[PDB]
Amino acid sequence: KGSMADVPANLMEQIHGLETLFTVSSEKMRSIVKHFISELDKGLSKKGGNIPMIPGWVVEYPTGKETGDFLALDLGGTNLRVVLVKLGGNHDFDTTQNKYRLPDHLRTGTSEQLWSFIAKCLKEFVDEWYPDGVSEPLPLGFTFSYPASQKKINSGVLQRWTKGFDIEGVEGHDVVPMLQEQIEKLNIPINVVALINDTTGTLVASLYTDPQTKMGIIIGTGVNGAYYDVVSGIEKLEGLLPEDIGPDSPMAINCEYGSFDNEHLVLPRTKYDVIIDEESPRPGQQAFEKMTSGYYLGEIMRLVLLDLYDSGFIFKDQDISKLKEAYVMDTSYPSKIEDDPFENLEDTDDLFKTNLNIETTVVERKLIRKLAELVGTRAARLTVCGVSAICDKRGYKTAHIAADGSVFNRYPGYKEKAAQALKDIYNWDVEKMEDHPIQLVAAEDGSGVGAAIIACLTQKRLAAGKSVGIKGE
Amino acid sequence: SMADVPANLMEQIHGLETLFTVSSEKMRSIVKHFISELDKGLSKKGGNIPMIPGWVVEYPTGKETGDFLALDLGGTNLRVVLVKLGGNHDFDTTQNKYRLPDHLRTGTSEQLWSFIAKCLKEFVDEWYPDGVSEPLPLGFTFSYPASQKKINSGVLQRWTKGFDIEGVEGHDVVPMLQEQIEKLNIPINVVALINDTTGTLVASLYTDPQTKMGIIIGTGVNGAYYDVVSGIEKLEGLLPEDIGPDSPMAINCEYGSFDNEHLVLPRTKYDVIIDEESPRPGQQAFEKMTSGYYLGEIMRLVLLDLYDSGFIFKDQDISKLKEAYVMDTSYPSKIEDDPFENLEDTDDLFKTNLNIETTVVERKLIRKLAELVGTRAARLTVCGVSAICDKRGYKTAHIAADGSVFNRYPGYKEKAAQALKDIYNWDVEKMEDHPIQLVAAEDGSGVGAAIIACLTQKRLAAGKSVGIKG
């Protein structure tokens, strides 16, 4: 009975236009899902597609029965962490970790400098927690989130550095023996048995603790999704697989679906999304990421607000200079705006006054709050198309979708928006979000615990002479 | 851990360990005196702990139904909540929140109460646009120090939070609010006034039948629990027939003032300085020792001491460190949360905010200190829990906890659970199976006030008493 109550016609007309632009109907969500499924298939065929659909070489489900000590290394752009995981054999584990800031020089240093530094961290970690030593070398899973290809789980050929890394002699080389040799130079009892993407670990660690997990999903600054296909449904692997990775074998897939619809034929791009892509570092790339990542939501809002300012609707007597800086509005903007509990939107007031030097009227803030809501809701509804596509493709009528990332974890009402979206797509007759057949739930730690459990599943196969990659690798 | 710390500094660290460590023995001795002071507050003579009756004389069953209002008055904001009870330990809520105008703190009484009534009007017109047929019962959370002779009364003893409004101290705030409601014609009855902690207790008992205490651990500290009428000497001869000796009675302890006599709390010289330099020296002793408001200040004074004795920050500009309260709760909290081997979060904190560069060893000392401070505060806080549970013979209990320290201070739940285990020395493995344990509270000052209002309205409708006779 309230809401946009006090908004003048000149402005209400603009909001309606924005509602049209940013609303994704159930019909549109289903049409996207079909194109998505199509692209997942295309990605698993010999021909390939925009969606990479990368085999992760985890060829079995965790049972929950696994036991013992395993390690993870999570190497990022700024930090690494080392994680010790003790598997309890009953869908349970204890963890302990330490975290290390990378020295400034590693970014542009030598290959040796990077791997020897990681190795010193490993030794210091291992010395502390096993004063006496270990019966067997500790299997280690390496989350190496840099573009990298592999023909077996226990390798990773770097395609290219990102995040400002610029180390010679690594691109086009297998990083696993690089690290392994620095480990042994220090005499650390560790075997690097796997290299993974964090999203694969998210899938694996979560299926370990929660048997109903059918997907690992990351929604933050980046987006990605991982799930288990079956070898027999992967045309591109035909003629490449060894005897003991048979057709019924599970195969974890790292989708890298951020690239879905780079053709721009499916997603509902607005004039604002076009500007964002055109002005971005890689125009025409990362289409789905650009439509779902939390990284762009403030930027969408900025461009809308600039458009409305330039057309003379808002901020009429204000100095809007600071709003002219690309990315000046990060994810905290829509987040704080949707989270604002005040009738007069005092948090929104404070955000604009103190960070942008813009004073607003109540009506203006009402429009700003409506705009953040449309943008957040759009993102969730598009994201959930990825989830639905994976479930429909695989026949999962029910599922826990194990979710992580700064948006899922911290964007206000995101869980509610996503559950509503899934309910809209399938048209479920259900009361409470807890009862939805397909539902997002908090993931386990993917880049750490997930990598360690992958190390376990890998070790058991290596110790029995069972393959974990294309025959002859 | 601390292998890199030289011997001379390690001695200073040991000294601080000694000063800030609370033994399980000292915890039990403090509890023993805390129980005595709870008793003295319930006696005719009274004591330093006010032990205010909250006039909630029954337990919620969870079978209550209906539509109920709450008003939560803070120092910055007020919240109006509509609560719908569904008859099964369940509820739906919707709320609005309003910012108090700048001038209210030092304005007139009329200005405060009419602003609040105006917010109530807007809320009711939004959710009941066609009006109602009979008044909506409202519970009013008013957490300032206040005596109560009846559920729907609150005589302000003392403004806090920088409120300085004339003609309120010493007077019942309920009629002042009710009056402005009438002027605007809002179909509301203010049927109850409550302290937030009382609401914490009652709302949490409504959804969790094992709740035996409501506790707030934040800027302010307080606890509430149900005593029994026969254990409240100060009400003897004051009660009507239908509030008998066996009736439950919710008690708002206001135990921040526990041990103002300085006889049991293990105050260090740093605690003494904080007290002497505070706006109310000699008051709020227990609060000063357990509130989150002082945790950074304690650290600030220790560090300043070590600097003055030539141990740390030797070549640093420590001027920012000389300002009182410059270090709020976010300092020990971010420091304890620092996940880096070389304490990189602590580094940025000091450089960026205090313009102080630290060595690795100094940051190890700093982190050690924050742990000591946080741990001490949790152990002293649970002396209050333990005192209430031992007073009433609760051998098992859920302690419904709320407040910025309980909710956000790093590892606090673990420190508190370990402190209870140390006190009782239980035979128990998993922290989740602790006999007496803190659990997350329901919304005290919203959902709690509405439920108390529901309980009160039920008594009134049947003619039953809700205060002293008279």
UniProtKB/Swiss-Prot annotation, chain A:
Residues 197-445 are annotated as: Hexokinase large subdomain. One of its GO terms (biological process) is glucose metabolic process. The modification Phosphoserine is found at S3. Keywords: Allosteric enzyme, ATP-binding, Glycolysis, Kinase, Nucleotide-binding, Phosphoprotein, Transferase. The keyword Amino-acid biosynthesis does not apply. GO terms for molecular function: ATP binding; D-glucose binding; fructokinase activity; glucokinase activity; mannokinase activity. Pathway: Carbohydrate metabolism; hexose metabolism; Carbohydrate degradation; glycolysis; D-glyceraldehyde 3-phosphate and glycerone phosphate from D-glucose: step 1/4. Its EC number is 2.7.1.1. Residues 63-196 are annotated as: Hexokinase small subdomain. Monomer and homodimer. The monomeric form is active, the homodimeric form inactive. Catalyzes the phosphorylation of hexose, such as D-glucose and D-fructose, to hexose 6-phosphate (D-glucose 6-phosphate and D-fructose 6-phosphate, respectively). Has higher affinity for D-glucose. Mediates the initial step of glycolysis by catalyzing phosphorylation of D-glucose to D-glucose 6-phosphate. Belongs to the hexokinase family. This is Hexokinase. It comes from Kluyveromyces lactis (strain ATCC 8585 / CBS 2359 / DSM 70799 / NBRC 1267 / NRRL Y-1140 / WM37) (Yeast). The lineage of its organism: Eukaryota, Fungi, Dikarya, Ascomycota, Saccharomycotina.
